[PDB]
Amino acid sequence: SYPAIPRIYAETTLNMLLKRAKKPRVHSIDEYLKDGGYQALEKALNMSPEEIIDWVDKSTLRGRGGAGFPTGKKWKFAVQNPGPRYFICNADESEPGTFKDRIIIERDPHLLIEGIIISSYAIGANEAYIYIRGEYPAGYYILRDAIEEAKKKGFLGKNILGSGFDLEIYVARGAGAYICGEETALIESLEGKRGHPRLKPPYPVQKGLWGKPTVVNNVETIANVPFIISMGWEEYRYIGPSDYAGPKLFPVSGKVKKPGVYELPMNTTLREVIFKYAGGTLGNKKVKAVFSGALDCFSSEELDIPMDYSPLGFGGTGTVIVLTEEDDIVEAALKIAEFYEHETCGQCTPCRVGCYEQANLLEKIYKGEATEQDWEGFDFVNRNIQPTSICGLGAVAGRLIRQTLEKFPEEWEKYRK
Amino acid sequence: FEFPEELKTKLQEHINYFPKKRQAILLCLHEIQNYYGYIPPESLKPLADMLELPLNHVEGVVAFYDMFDREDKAKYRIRVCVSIPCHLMGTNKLLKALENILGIKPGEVTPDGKFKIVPVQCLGACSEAPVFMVNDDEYKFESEVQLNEILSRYT
Ligand SMILES: Cc1cc2nc3c(=O)[nH]c(=O)nc-3n(C[C@H](O)[C@H](O)[C@H](O)COP(=O)(O)O)c2cc1C
Ligand code: SF4
Ligand code: FES
Ligand code: NA
Ligand code: NA
Question: Where does the chain bind FMN (chain A)?
Answer without folding.
Answer: 174-221
